[PDB]
Every structure is written in structure tokens, then in C-alpha cells.
Design an enzyme around this catalytic site. Structure first.
Site, PDB file in Angstrom:
ATOM      1  N   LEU A  25       0.809  -1.475  -0.191  1.00  0.00           N
ATOM      2  CA  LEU A  25       0.636  -0.085  -0.405  1.00  0.00           C
ATOM      3  C   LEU A  25       0.775   1.309  -0.169  1.00  0.00           C
ATOM      4  O   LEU A  25       0.686   1.760   0.775  1.00  0.00           O
ATOM      5  CB  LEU A  25      -0.940  -0.100   1.801  1.00  0.00           C
ATOM      6  N   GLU A  32      -7.391  11.196   3.057  1.00  0.00           N
ATOM      7  CA  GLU A  32      -7.916  10.483   1.923  1.00  0.00           C
ATOM      8  C   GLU A  32      -8.738   9.177   2.229  1.00  0.00           C
ATOM      9  O   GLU A  32     -10.005   9.687   2.087  1.00  0.00           O
ATOM     10  CB  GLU A  32      -6.760   9.514   0.656  1.00  0.00           C
TER      11      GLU A  32
HETATM   12  N1  LIG Z   1      -5.027   1.503  -1.672  1.00  0.00           N
HETATM   13  C1  LIG Z   1      -5.876   0.845  -2.375  1.00  0.00           C
HETATM   14  O1  LIG Z   1      -6.976   1.916  -1.918  1.00  0.00           O
HETATM   15  C2  LIG Z   1      -6.531  -0.581  -1.512  1.00  0.00           C
HETATM   16  C3  LIG Z   1      -8.229  -0.645  -1.507  1.00  0.00           C
HETATM   17  C4  LIG Z   1      -7.959  -2.571  -1.544  1.00  0.00           C
HETATM   18  C5  LIG Z   1      -6.974  -2.934  -2.171  1.00  0.00           C
HETATM   19  N2  LIG Z   1      -6.072  -2.791  -1.903  1.00  0.00           N
HETATM   20  C6  LIG Z   1      -4.640  -3.696  -2.728  1.00  0.00           C
HETATM   21  O2  LIG Z   1      -4.626  -4.399  -3.914  1.00  0.00           O
HETATM   22  C7  LIG Z   1      -4.641  -5.807  -4.260  1.00  0.00           C
HETATM   23  C8  LIG Z   1      -5.649  -7.257  -4.093  1.00  0.00           C
HETATM   24  O3  LIG Z   1      -6.114  -6.929  -5.360  1.00  0.00           O
HETATM   25  P1  LIG Z   1      -7.604  -7.540  -5.898  1.00  0.00           P
HETATM   26  O4  LIG Z   1      -7.640  -7.584  -7.355  1.00  0.00           O
HETATM   27  O5  LIG Z   1      -6.731  -9.183  -5.700  1.00  0.00           O
HETATM   28  O6  LIG Z   1      -8.444  -7.885  -4.728  1.00  0.00           O
HETATM   29  P2  LIG Z   1     -10.048  -8.097  -4.953  1.00  0.00           P
HETATM   30  O7  LIG Z   1     -10.551  -7.866  -5.518  1.00  0.00           O
HETATM   31  O8  LIG Z   1     -10.187  -7.367  -3.276  1.00  0.00           O
HETATM   32  O9  LIG Z   1     -10.167  -9.303  -4.147  1.00  0.00           O
HETATM   33  C9  LIG Z   1      -9.839 -10.425  -5.218  1.00  0.00           C
HETATM   34  C10 LIG Z   1     -10.844 -11.976  -5.009  1.00  0.00           C
HETATM   35  O10 LIG Z   1     -12.107 -11.147  -4.922  1.00  0.00           O
HETATM   36  C11 LIG Z   1     -12.986 -11.962  -5.703  1.00  0.00           C
HETATM   37  N3  LIG Z   1     -13.364 -11.808  -6.695  1.00  0.00           N
HETATM   38  C12 LIG Z   1     -12.935 -10.641  -7.346  1.00  0.00           C
HETATM   39  N4  LIG Z   1     -13.751 -10.467  -8.341  1.00  0.00           N
HETATM   40  C13 LIG Z   1     -14.600 -11.203  -8.598  1.00  0.00           C
HETATM   41  C14 LIG Z   1     -16.201 -12.247  -9.115  1.00  0.00           C
HETATM   42  N5  LIG Z   1     -16.430 -11.398 -10.289  1.00  0.00           N
HETATM   43  N6  LIG Z   1     -16.289 -12.990  -8.789  1.00  0.00           N
HETATM   44  C15 LIG Z   1     -15.838 -14.037  -7.617  1.00  0.00           C
HETATM   45  N7  LIG Z   1     -15.255 -13.569  -7.024  1.00  0.00           N
HETATM   46  C16 LIG Z   1     -14.535 -12.610  -7.515  1.00  0.00           C
HETATM   47  C17 LIG Z   1     -11.683 -13.858  -5.696  1.00  0.00           C
HETATM   48  O11 LIG Z   1     -12.753 -14.180  -4.288  1.00  0.00           O
HETATM   49  P3  LIG Z   1     -11.901 -16.280  -4.486  1.00  0.00           P
HETATM   50  O12 LIG Z   1     -10.392 -16.376  -4.894  1.00  0.00           O
HETATM   51  O13 LIG Z   1     -12.223 -16.500  -3.137  1.00  0.00           O
HETATM   52  O14 LIG Z   1     -12.851 -16.383  -5.832  1.00  0.00           O
HETATM   53  C18 LIG Z   1     -10.395 -12.708  -5.550  1.00  0.00           C
HETATM   54  O15 LIG Z   1      -9.533 -13.563  -5.212  1.00  0.00           O
HETATM   55  C19 LIG Z   1      -4.393  -6.205  -2.852  1.00  0.00           C
HETATM   56  O16 LIG Z   1      -2.701  -6.332  -2.548  1.00  0.00           O
HETATM   57  C20 LIG Z   1      -4.226  -4.692  -1.456  1.00  0.00           C
HETATM   58  O17 LIG Z   1      -2.747  -3.842  -1.215  1.00  0.00           O
HETATM   59  C21 LIG Z   1      -5.289  -0.919  -2.220  1.00  0.00           C
HETATM   60  N1  LIG Z   2     -10.449   6.966  -2.858  1.00  0.00           N
HETATM   61  C1  LIG Z   2     -10.557   5.826  -2.239  1.00  0.00           C
HETATM   62  N2  LIG Z   2     -11.253   4.698  -2.664  1.00  0.00           N
HETATM   63  C2  LIG Z   2     -11.244   3.701  -2.582  1.00  0.00           C
HETATM   64  N3  LIG Z   2     -12.131   2.045  -2.669  1.00  0.00           N
HETATM   65  C3  LIG Z   2     -10.454   2.949  -0.812  1.00  0.00           C
HETATM   66  C4  LIG Z   2      -9.422   1.481   0.186  1.00  0.00           C
HETATM   67  C5  LIG Z   2      -9.744   2.128   1.089  1.00  0.00           C
HETATM   68  C6  LIG Z   2      -9.870   0.710   1.710  1.00  0.00           C
HETATM   69  N4  LIG Z   2      -9.380   0.929   3.470  1.00  0.00           N
HETATM   70  C7  LIG Z   2     -10.073   1.480   4.675  1.00  0.00           C
HETATM   71  C8  LIG Z   2      -9.220   1.287   5.704  1.00  0.00           C
HETATM   72  C9  LIG Z   2      -7.756   0.728   5.165  1.00  0.00           C
HETATM   73  C10 LIG Z   2      -6.840   0.457   5.926  1.00  0.00           C
HETATM   74  C11 LIG Z   2      -5.497  -0.128   5.748  1.00  0.00           C
HETATM   75  C12 LIG Z   2      -5.800  -0.628   4.154  1.00  0.00           C
HETATM   76  C13 LIG Z   2      -7.252  -0.201   2.992  1.00  0.00           C
HETATM   77  C14 LIG Z   2      -7.983   0.315   4.160  1.00  0.00           C
HETATM   78  C15 LIG Z   2      -8.442   3.171   0.933  1.00  0.00           C
HETATM   79  C16 LIG Z   2      -8.730   4.473   0.698  1.00  0.00           C
HETATM   80  C17 LIG Z   2      -9.331   4.363  -0.406  1.00  0.00           C
HETATM   81  N5  LIG Z   2      -9.938   5.836  -1.607  1.00  0.00           N
END
Ligand SMILES: NC(=O)c1ccc[n+]([C@@H]2O[C@H](COP(=O)([O-])OP(=O)(O)OC[C@H]3O[C@@H](n4cnc5c(N)ncnc54)[C@H](OP(=O)(O)O)[C@@H]3O)[C@@H](O)[C@H]2O)c1
Ligand SMILES: NC1NC(N)C2C[C@@H](CN3CCC4CCCCC43)CCC2N1
Length: 206
Positions: A25, A32
Site C-alpha cells: 500500500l 484520503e
Molecule cells: N490502496 C487502496 O486503497 C487499496 C484498497 C483494496 C485493496 N488494495 C490492494 O490491491 C490488491 C488486491 O487486488 P485484487 O484484485 O486481487 O483484489 P480483490 O478484488 O479485492 O480480491 C480478489 C478476490 O476477489 C474475488 N473476486 C473478485 N472479483 C470477483 C468476481 N467477479 N467473481 C468472483 N469472485 C471475485 C476473488 O475471490 P475468490 O478467490 O475467493 O473467488 C479473488 O481472489 C491487494 O494486494 C491490496 O494491497 C489497495
Molecule cells: N478514494 C479511495 N477509494 C477506495 N476504494 C479506498 C479503499 C480504502 C480501504 N481501507 C479502509 C481502511 C483501510 C486500512 C488499511 C488498508 C486499506 C483500507 C482506502 C482508501 C480508498 N480511497
């Protein structure tokens, strides 16, 4: 009667569309998150006695959130996932797809429920975003632009801010954003912990 509401995508990404870094992250933005919570929680005062918003997110996202803020209070939480084994929770819902979750929300929260849905927000998952972008109800994106080319290993699936999509997605005026979010919101960029970002709202016709 399964599509009586449009969906909204809310996300924070860099100019390069990066949204994730090997779990990590890439940035520290306490403000934000504050905006995030405010936007996904806002509901018209009049109908605030029962109405509640919904947040749909992928499994990975659900794990990425500390037990602390889980589940997101004041909002209906629904995690999308196929392989659902020892799924915990207590007030959270579970769906195998974006359309499956919607139908469940309309049946579980119909006129026979004391809790009515107001706005549906797609908040997390590169994968979930993919499904959302292709959805015929998604007509709005609440985006936070991080002007810092950091390192990410997960990107947003569609370059909606690029010229190729400029005839479809259009950026709204600041006042229009503030209007949709009801409350006031900062104009221009916001520097926090060495990061410069800004809030934008994008919409398209269905
Ligand atoms: N910066 C931010 O605000 C923020 C917010 C959220 C996450 N993140 C990050 O982004 C990364 C993850 O990305 P992501 O794409 O892998 O995660 P995601 O979409 O949250 O989780 C992927 C899981 O979601 C399920 N899924 C998603 N779309 C689906 C569909 N259409 N049908 C069925 N199941 C579905 C699946 O679960 P099953 O495998 O159980 O089927 C798949 O393994 C993480 O490493 C994290 O650090 C950042
Ligand atoms: N603009 C915006 N759109 C989103 N979908 C967001 C996902 C949020 C998910 N959260 C809530 C508390 C969290 C703690 C630690 C890791 C991730 C966390 C973070 C900020 C986002 N901002």
C-alpha cells in the site's frame, strides 16, 4: 427489478493507474481515508433514519483491511467471492459475483426491511473493478489522483482518464462533485505525508 439503481466506483490511483503494490500500500493518506469514509457514508438527512449505503469489495480487499475497521460501520458490507469456505462475519453478506450480490441486496433489503439501500459503491479489488467497469449500471467513478509515480504491481483495468476514452468518460465540475457528495470537499491538490493528490468525479451516459 434487479437494476433499479446505478453503481459507483470509488478508487485511489496514480497517474499511471497503479492501485496496489504487492499487498504493501504505497502511501500514507489519513485524509484520503477520511474522504473515503465520508463519501461512502453520506446519505440524505431526511431519509437517514433508515437508508444506508452499500460497499462491495473483493476478498483480497476485505483482508487488506485491519480487524479494526472491519466491517465498515454505518454501511452494508458485502464481500464478493466464489470459493467461500470458513467465511466469518456477523453482519456482512457474501456473493459469488457482482450481479449475484445485487439480487441478494434487493431481496434482503426490500420494502419488507427496515433498512433501505441508498447508494451502492464498488470500493475494492482490481478484479472487482474489472467486473464493474463492464457493468451496464456503473456510470460514475469517484477517483483520487495521486501525482506520484511510485511502484505498484496492480493497476486499474481501464484508462478512463486517457484520450482514447474521452468521448465516453467525462470529468465533472468541482461544484458538481461537492453536490453529489453533499458536503464540502477540498478543491485542488492536498499534500499529505509527502504526497500530492486530488479528488475527481467522472461520469458517462448509460
Ligand atoms: N490502496 C487502496 O486503497 C487499496 C484498497 C483494496 C485493496 N488494495 C490492494 O490491491 C490488491 C488486491 O487486488 P485484487 O484484485 O486481487 O483484489 P480483490 O478484488 O479485492 O480480491 C480478489 C478476490 O476477489 C474475488 N473476486 C473478485 N472479483 C470477483 C468476481 N467477479 N467473481 C468472483 N469472485 C471475485 C476473488 O475471490 P475468490 O478467490 O475467493 O473467488 C479473488 O481472489 C491487494 O494486494 C491490496 O494491497 C489497495
Ligand atoms: N478514494 C479511495 N477509494 C477506495 N476504494 C479506498 C479503499 C480504502 C480501504 N481501507 C479502509 C481502511 C483501510 C486500512 C488499511 C488498508 C486499506 C483500507 C482506502 C482508501 C480508498 N480511497
Amino acid at each position: 427489478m434487479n437494476q433499479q439503481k446505478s453503481l459507483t466506483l470509488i478508487v485511489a490511483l496514480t497517474t499511471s493507474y497503479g492501485i496496489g503494490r504487492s499487498n504493501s500500500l504505497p502511501w500514507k493518506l489519513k485524509k484520503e481515508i477520511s474522504y473515503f469514509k465520508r463519501v461512502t457514508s453520506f446519505v440524505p438527512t431526511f431519509d437517514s433514519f433508515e437508508s444506508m449505503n452499500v460497499v462491495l469489495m473483493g476478498r483480497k480487499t476485505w483482508e487488506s483491511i485491519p480487524l479494526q475497521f472491519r466491517p465498515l460501520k454505518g454501511r452494508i458490507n458485502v464481500v464478493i467471492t466464489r470459493n467461500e469456505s470458513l467465511d466469518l462475519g456477523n453482519g456482512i453478506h457474501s456473493a459469488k459475483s457482482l450481479d449475484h450480490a445485487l439480487e441478494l441486496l434487493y431481496r434482503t433489503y426490500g420494502s419488507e426491511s427496515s433498512v433501505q439501500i441508498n447508494r451502492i459503491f464498488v470500493i475494492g479489488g482490481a478484479q472487482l473493478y474489472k467486473a464493474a467497469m463492464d457493468h451496464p449500471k456503473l456510470d460514475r467513478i469517484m477517483a483520487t489522483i495521486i501525482y506520484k509515480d511510485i511502484h505498484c504491481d496492480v493497476f486499474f483495468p481501464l484508462k478512463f482518464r486517457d484520450k482514447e476514452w474521452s468521448s465516453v468518460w467525462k470529468k465533472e465540475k468541482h461544484s458538481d462533485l461537492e453536490s453529489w457528495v453533499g458536503t464540502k470537499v477540498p478543491h485542488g491538490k492536498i499534500n499529505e505525508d509527502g504526497f500530492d493528490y486530488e479528488f475527481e468525479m467522472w461520469t458517462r451516459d448509460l
